[PDB]
Nucleic acid binder design. Structure first.
Length: 400
RNA sequence: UGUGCCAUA
């Protein structure tokens, strides 16, 4: 802090004016100091004369290097965002030159700003507050090489991509969809803790749900094609995705979203069906198998049930079948609990049995009798386990 | 008896 702005206690003076700081030439010293930036943030929200704004514009967002210095500063980035807001609210003759400049500054340093913990915040507010036509040019400045992968999996930069998805029309970021759908890119991004959230955010935006009814038909068509291309890529790798520590959340999202019903069915047929016993025994994929049972169309649900009850040959020596392996497995037990719950819900009316013009009620009764007969026969062993006790309880509590 | 991310003074 400048000596002129300090007392004899070494602390920043009180009754300090915004014009004193703007005139001094010392703004950069205040903006990167906690207390100094704290004063500027208050001063900047008040009534500003034309000249005060003019000076903030020139000092905070008028020169590339000071702008970068502040944007990437722990305290400075807040002043930059405030001044960007004030710039956008000030429709004088210099409006367009200021906004074009800001667009140039950021564009030329897009990647580095995105990856910066503080500058990514400047990017994000610019994206949502700038005129749409200028915000779209910020998106064009995104990298198209390995740097985009790095952006998607970065703890800071992933929020930039998510913001783009939120406030920019699809045409401008359609390249990100195609980038992510590329087989090797999808693999890397989906199997990352930040990247899998980015991919789901993209999927949600590409879904024709209640939040997209404002779209024109041409825009819905554009959305559908992009969805279709991303989903094709996801389903081509559903096996790797469903079994992965992070990507399983994506597969669960698709499987349980009614507005993605056609893709849910594709996934079930592509990697789930015929692998139910195997997958039910995996730490990550068992959650996906539960989702499938819960949201499958009744025709596929019947196939899934039939696979568990009669899809596998028992062990040649002991007589242990798929249901046996599953009821006692550390992960598979949750899938059996899920099958039971579905049947009880159906038979007690808590779940719609009509679908495909016909009533599948007797199928549910059939599956329930199977489960009830097994649990009755194995009650002694099942009562050793929390999961077993839960099933026994469920069956008795349905009779009541 | 079984998994994540939701990030600045």
């Amino acid at each position: 802090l400048p000596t002129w702005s300090l007392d004899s206690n070494g602390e920043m003076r009180s009754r300090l004016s915004l014009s004193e700081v703007l005139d001094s030439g010392d703004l950069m010293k205040f903006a990167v100091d906690k207390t100094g930036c704290q004063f500027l943030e208050k001063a900047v929200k008040g009534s500003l004369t034309s000249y005060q704004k003019f000076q903030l514009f020139e000092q905070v967002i008028g020169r590339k290097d000071d702008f970068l210095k502040l944007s990437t500063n722990i305290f400075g980035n807040y002043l930059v965002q405030s001044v960007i807001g004030i710039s956008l609210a000030t429709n004088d003759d210099g409006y367009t030159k200021r906004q074009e400049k800001l667009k140039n500054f950021i564009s030329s340093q897009m990647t580095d700003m995105c990856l910066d913990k503080f500058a990514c915040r400047v990017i994000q507010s610019s994206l949502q507050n700038m005129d749409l036509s200028l915000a779209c040019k910020l998106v064009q400045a995104l990298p198209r090489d390995a740097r985009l992968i790095a952006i998607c999996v970065d703890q800071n930069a992933n929020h930039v991509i998510q913001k783009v998805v939120a406030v920019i029309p699809l045409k401008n970021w359609e390249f990100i969809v195609d980038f992510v759908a590329t087989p090797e890119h999808l693999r890397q991004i989906c199997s990352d803790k930040y990247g899998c959230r980015v991919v789901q955010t993209i999927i949600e935006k590409l879904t024709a749900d209640s939040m997209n009814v404002d779209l024109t038909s041409a825009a819905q068509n554009l959305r559908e094609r992009a969805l279709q291309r991303l989903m094709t890529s996801v389903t081509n790798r559903c096996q790797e995705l469903a079994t992965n520590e992070y990507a399983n959340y994506i597969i669960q999202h698709i499987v349980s979203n009614d507005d993605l019903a056609v893709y849910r069915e594709c996934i079930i047929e592509k990697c789930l069906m015929r692998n139910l016993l195997s997958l039910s025994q995996e730490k990550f994929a068992s959650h996906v198998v539960e989702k499938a049972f819960l949201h499958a169309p009744l025709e596929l649900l019947a196939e899934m049930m039939d696979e568990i009850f009669d899809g596998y040959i028992p062990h040649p020596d002991t007589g242990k079948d798929a249901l046996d392996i599953m009821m006692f497995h550390q992960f598979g037990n949750y899938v059996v609990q899920c099958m039971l719950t579905i049947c009880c819900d159906a038979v007690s009316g808590r779940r719609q049995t009509k679908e495909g013009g016909y009533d599948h009620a007797i199928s549910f009764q059939d599956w329930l009798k199977k489960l009830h007969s097994r649990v009755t026969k194995e009650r002694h062993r099942l009562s050793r386990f929390s999961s077993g006790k839960k099933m026994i309880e469920t069956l008795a509590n349905l009779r009541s």
